[PDB]
Amino acid sequence: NQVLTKKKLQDLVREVDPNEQLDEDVEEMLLQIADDFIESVVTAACQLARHRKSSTLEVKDVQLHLERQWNMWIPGFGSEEIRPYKKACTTEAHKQRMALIRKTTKK
Amino acid sequence: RKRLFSKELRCMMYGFGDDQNPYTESVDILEDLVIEFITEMTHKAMSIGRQGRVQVEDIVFLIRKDPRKFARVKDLLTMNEELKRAR
Amino acid sequence: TPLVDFLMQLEDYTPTIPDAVTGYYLNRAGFEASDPRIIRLISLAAQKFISDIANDALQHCKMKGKDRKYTLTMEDLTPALSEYGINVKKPHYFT
């Protein structure tokens, strides 16, 4: 029950520079890094599914963790059409307190 | 969502050297890049300039990121006037 | 290599940040800069960084239209810094 098998990792190095080797100190860490990240994606995508009062992990909350934290957009999956972007819901209390900063400044 | 750029994008990949018959899962990828590119150049364009979508702020993002998008938007704005001067 | 052939275009340039200022901030960073062309390259690369934040804030100010004197207000610098990795968030109206 391992997800990466040291031949898929070796081809990942061969596609970058084919005359390059890794050490077993580096390979045993490149494997650790992979598994450790799988865990942090899932542990922080289950709670987004738990906040949707659902019990199924969809692809719409593995998207929101990688985009916001890890800066990864995985292209070939597609989403629903994004709703019209709400720009500024500035409240009345901010519209009247910030209209006092200018009232003292110029008057 | 359906695919709104399935037949148009196959002509464009042939235009840049791909094939006459690209794979379906490659146009699956390129169709999702364009919808995010138009979204992530409109979500950031409604905070700059004003909270509208005037094209005087679409030309701001193209400088200092890639000059090919800026040198190919000055040609589409110049040739709009040379194609109304001919009428 | 481009880093060497660029450095021949730097013998006619003189950055605004002096060499004693830059040569001190490399001393806190961990080395004494012996070659004075490395001081002329880290100061130019850091002068270019300020000269794009202060220029994006100008085009942010010239995109709100007032056309006589341009004041470097925080309303033009705070969106101009977010394009790079500087995220300031200043408060107002402390209750």
Place this chain on the structure above:
Amino acid sequence: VNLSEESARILATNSELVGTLTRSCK
């Protein structure tokens, strides 16, 4: 009237030449 019918002829040939067979990939 000349601009209206000739606009769709630049795109009609863009459905006869390119993309004859549809492929896929594993």
Place this chain on the structure above:
Amino acid sequence: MPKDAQMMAQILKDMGITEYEPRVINQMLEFAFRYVTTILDDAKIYSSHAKKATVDADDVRLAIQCRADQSFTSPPPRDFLLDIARQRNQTPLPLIKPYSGPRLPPDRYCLTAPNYRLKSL
């Protein structure tokens, strides 16, 4: 002095801070404004992800806990530092060669290197 700068001096006085610079209270109010407007940033992203109208308390409770790992990551816990040590503390101490001059690590871990510089042509 607003009511939250009058309370920021109480927090530092409750610690072992009796003599501070007066610029500190202006700094600890900018940090406290940047923190709540970053939690409420993420609490609005999570309210729209569950597709609700307002920002409820369970959104702010998630936004607190889901940014205690990147914004305020911790020094390693005591149960982890004990297990790392007690396998390191079991290998014996090696013996020393009698005359080896300067005793140093191998050459790829030291800072001894030929240390070149450009020909000022």
Place this chain on the structure above:
Amino acid sequence: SEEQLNRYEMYRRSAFPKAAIKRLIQSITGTSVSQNVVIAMSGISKVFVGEVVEEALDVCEKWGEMPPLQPKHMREAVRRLKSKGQIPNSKHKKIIFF
């Protein structure tokens, strides 16, 4: 030749339709856009497709594969473009000072 003239024909004549992008942008703004916005936004997205395919054919020429483009060369194309800042993401608040 006889393929270069057909390829140059598709490089110029191909475009996204203005009747759909004006439908696509207005679903993001809320109210309305102008014709000179849709003309530019349909033109930048052709450069962006030409930024990926011209660079996804550099991934395929680097590895030992042929012109048909698998998705392996397309996820790698977005990876190399994002590391040079070409692909903008407005949902990742980046920080340069650490």
